[PDB]
Symmetry: C3
Subunit: 240 residues, 3 copies
């Protein structure tokens, strides 16, 4: 249970899944998307569906995750998926830093004119101003982002969860890891640890608006995400 | 901490205590019992008092139970005893499937409960527990898990080591779920369904307790003391 | 994580820090203190500032204390310090059973407290803590357990690692229970009685705080900072 073990999970999940994807997003005949922009939106859907698949395998390799009861595993993923994805876009969008580019990967990105065009420039802006900019301003490193993402995953306050204690414990061990990293690498500002945590509330708020947009444009599967997560979990991992 | 380490505790407690008994149930002079049946009721008392003694030795062997302060060990037993006993009878009565078993031999017929007024309890034990357990194909490992979950209860007033107790319960959850994923690849809803029996066990168990303080067949000494005394004492064989 | 481990921390922190101090108490220019009584009060300040330094090193050595985030470490020390100091004076003063001891040799007579206007605190420390501890035959090892229970407080606002801290407190409970029923038999109610001293300690401790602020003999710098700075620095030889 170390930052290194958490890093390994992220990295391996990102390279061993190939093109496998959890198809939750997709444009159907009831989507509020103009016909001329279906190709574009569906491309965005394929990207997210692949990151979702990877996310599941990521959690599968996270310390203790596979041990909590399956029902708990499903709830944890349902509660943190959007925040985990947005944290990754915030980090990839640090390369080209009012910001004009939002990266989902290293080779797939949007300019602000397209957001404005799609009518989602407000969420485009706060992602870059409230997360990317402040992370850069803080000199956030890859190790600190991994810690923040784990803190998110290990959430014991979700309704319905069985193993709250076990989950809170994992979270606290990540706190300890994060603080040590702070102590070791940034002994000069004792306020760093707290500042890094301040990004979490902004991540949650932005993440909630994203979900609202998803429901509004109706590009989600009729099948409940819970089922999709449960099915991948009950299945073996890909060749990796 | 494994379904098998919990199984070992139950099994050993059931065979190594002999006829040793924790005397809580008793038929005395002030007891509201039909002298025409005092013998019968006192026989029921002896059975329960032996299962109570066994229960204490069971808990003594459960992972970490003997580590929390003694006051907490006493509170845990006082809160779970009836539910633990009734879980064992519900499991046994599955065999009959109007007969309720307390042992793998000692039983009681419907017509026996209608007499003492406890026909309601009799009915729901078989109705909500035995039948549904059978219907679910409940196995011994799962009953052991349900009973452990009951024992490790952190929400009781007065408890000191809540975190440890909860941590214990959660490890049993992890064991129960695994058992499911392995011996029931299918139905992902099994785990939760099994847990649904707990509320129905608690409710029935509370009724049984109200029907005890109503027959005056309990000791003048508070059960807490009896538990404390057996705990502060050594075990029977090993 | 046993009593021997907790005792070692206290003892070593008490002898390896030499004359170092964390200057939280000072007779500043804004102290409502009368000029004539400055040397005496400042002497009291130096004593407390040395015990504060030692306290930090004590915590730094306590099981798991150092791995939780600094911020939590800071909050724990800020909430516990006064109670930890007063627990030590209660124990010391036991010898005079008149006099209130801060050390095995630093002490005050009721008259001193009389003219300083703090005879109220003076009396309940000896009365509610020292006397009752003596009356209970409280031993050093046990005083260590009570002090750990105090340190490991998970209910403070702002704390991050509540679970881990609670787990630490509960392990001390088990230690205290084990010790208590082994060296002070003849009373299963001892454990609960020993814990009753905590609320008294907290109440008295809150009043002591009130006197500090009223008089204004505290540093212009927030104690949080002073704790954070000693924690972030290396320990003395130890
Ligand atoms: C992985 C995290 C992704 C976060 C990215 C958010 C920034 C938004 C990106 C801009 C999208 C441009 C699409 C191009 C189509 C276009 O120009 O579209 C242009 C058209 C304009 O048509 P009109 O001008 O005629 O009304 O708009 C549409 O038809 C609506 C497009 C649907 C918008 C879907 C976008 C999803 C909403 C984002 C929040 C959900 C996050 C899900 C991840 C958890
Ligand atoms: C192991 C848990 C036990 C769960 C209870 C299931 C057993 C129910 C069967 C009834 C018991 C037969 C007693 C004989 C009565 C009889 O024929 O005797 C018949 C008479 C009825 O009187 P009448 O002759 O006037 O109709 O009953 C009596 O003598 C009155 C005494 C009451 C009997 C005591 C019953 C105990 C209550 C059970 C609750 C125990 C739960 C607490 C432990 C967890
Ligand atoms: C280590 C904990 C110590 C707690 C023991 C309390 C006993 C206090 C003994 C009195 C000290 C006598 C000094 C002689 C000077 C004098 O007569 O003092 C005389 C003057 C009175 O002035 P006047 O006579 O002009 O009204 O008093 C003062 O100057 C104000 C008193 C300041 C002393 C503060 C101590 C109060 C206790 C607060 C608790 C702080 C501990 C917190 C850490 C846990």
């Amino acid at each position: 249970f170390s930052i290194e073990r958490i890093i390994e999970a992220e990295q391996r999940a990102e390279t061993q899944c190939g093109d496998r994807a959890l198809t939750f997003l997709r444009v159907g005949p009831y989507s509020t998307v103009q016909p001329d922009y279906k190709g574009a939106v569906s491309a965005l859907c394929q990207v997210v569906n692949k990151q979702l698949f990877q996310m599941v395998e990521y959690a599968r390799m996270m310390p203790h995750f596979a041990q909590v009861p399956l029902d708990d595993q499903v709830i944890l993923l349902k509660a943190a998926w959007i925040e985990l994805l947005i944290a990754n876009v915030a980090w990839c969008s640090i390369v080209s830093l009012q910001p004009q580019q939002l990266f989902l990967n290293q080779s797939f990105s949007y300019h602000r004119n397209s957001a404005i065009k799609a009518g989602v420039s407000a969420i485009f802006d706060r992602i870059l101003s409230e997360l990317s900019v402040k992370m850069k301003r803080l000199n956030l490193d890859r190790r600190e982002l991994s810690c923040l993402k784990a803190i998110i995953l290990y959430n014991p306050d979700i309704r319905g969860i069985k193993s709250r204690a076990e989950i809170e414990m994992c979270r606290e061990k990540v706190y300890a890891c994060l603080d040590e990293h702070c102590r070791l690498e940034h002994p000069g500002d004792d306020g760093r640890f707290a500042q890094l945590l301040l990004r979490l509330p902004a991540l949650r708020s932005i993440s909630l608006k994203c979900q609202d947009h998803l429901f509004l444009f109706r590009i989600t599967s009729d099948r409940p995400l819970e089922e999709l997560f449960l099915e991948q979990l009950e299945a073996p991992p890909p060749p990796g």
